Design a protein around this ligand. Structure first.
Ligand SMILES: *[C@@H]1O[C@H](CO)[C@@H](O)[C@H](O)[C@H]1NC(C)=O
Length: 329
């Protein structure tokens, strides 16, 4: 059940610790892994080769770096690498695959092997990567990504790891939840929600998009005066991102009540989100702007800053996302 997430210095923090100015730079790739601060561990093959990977609801693909990456792409060779020759359960596919990480592309080739997560082993097709772009993977500690999205938003319709876990019928519920710690680490839970890391009762919102973790938000109120999204804004609850995102035009109106107007005062107004008629509020605590074109545009993103306060259950059977007040012990 329990997969313990570990704390990580993001590529942003790695760059900001050095001291630097502003610099340059199929399904929709939502998250930039520049700001990601969390990873979990998974085992591939027989015997298991361990990999540090991001648990990302934004994507539906599982990829790790291969031993077969070229000398021309140096970002791949740094991380832990998958060798097919050390696995008895390896079964070759050979088909090309290409995820568009940002402007640049993450290229490789497909392959099948036994993938172990949270004690459960499943036969999974994954893309062993041969070309990672320079930004932002060279500085990043995490090896690859584990997609928690739907089969439709995967590449080549490859069934995700959670879908294979549902096929076995091992879990009590067909769900997974996420908890990020207030401070060292996190937690992904499979087949339920952990009562230690929540308080009160869950309340659920139905999924609006056909096959994604997207829900329609009905109000973004600053303090006690409403600004945006009364008619309806689409919102993705991403696990692999830390920041909260919004449309570029919408972000300006919220910032009013390169440039960020942050000064040391704790009496700034609380900001809340209306999800299924219930107000989900954040005291202080940052934002960003992502303008995606339609379809899947314009859209917001609720990252780890939201999920830190609210423990989030991702329900696949009922197609819904539940929220509840978080806590530690
Ligand atoms: C690779 O696996 C996929 C299943 O996701 C399948 O559709 C495809 O035919 C396989 N390709 C080869 C060359 O075996």
């Amino acid at each position: 059940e329990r997969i313990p997430l570990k704390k990580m210095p993001s590529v942003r923090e790695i760059l900001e610790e050095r001291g630097v100015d502003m610099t340059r730079l199929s399904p929709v790739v939502l998250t930039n892994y520049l700001n990601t601060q969390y990873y979990g561990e998974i085992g591939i093959g027989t015997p298991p080769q361990t990999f540090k990977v991001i648990f990302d609801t934004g994507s539906a693909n599982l990829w790790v770096p291969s031993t077969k990456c070229s000398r021309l792409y140096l970002a791949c060779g740094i991380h832990s690498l998958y060798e097919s020759s050390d696995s008895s359960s390896y079964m070759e596919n050979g088909s090309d695959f290409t995820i568009h990480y940002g402007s640049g592309r993450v290229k490789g080739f497909l392959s099948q092997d036994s993938v172990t997560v949270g004690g459960i082993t499943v036969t999974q097709t994954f893309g062993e990567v041969t070309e990672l772009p320079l930004i932002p993977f060279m500085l990043a500690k995490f090896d690859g990504v584990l997609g928690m999205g739907f089969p439709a938003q995967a590449v080549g319709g490859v069934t995700p790891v959670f879908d294979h876990i549902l096929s076995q019928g091992v879990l009590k519920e067909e769900v997974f939840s996420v908890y990020y710690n207030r401070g060292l680490g996190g937690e992904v839970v499979l087949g339920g929600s952990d009562p230690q890391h929540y308080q009160g009762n869950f309340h659920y919102v139905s999924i609006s998009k056909t096959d994604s973790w997207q829900i329609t938000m009905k109000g973004v109120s600053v303090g006690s005066s409403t600004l945006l999204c009364e008619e309806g804004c689409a919102v993705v609850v991403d696990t692999g991102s830390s920041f909260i995102s919004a449309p570029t035009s919408s972000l300006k109106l919220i910032m009013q009540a390169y440039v960020v107007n942050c000064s040391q005062v704790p009496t700034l107004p609380d900001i809340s989100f209306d999800l299924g008629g219930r107000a989900y509020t954040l005291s202080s605590t940052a934002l960003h702007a992502m303008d995606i074109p339609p379809p899947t545009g314009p859209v917001w993103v609720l990252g780890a800053t939201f999920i830190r306060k609210f423990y989030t259950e991702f329900d696949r059977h009922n197609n819904r996302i539940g929220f509840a007040l978080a806590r530690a012990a």
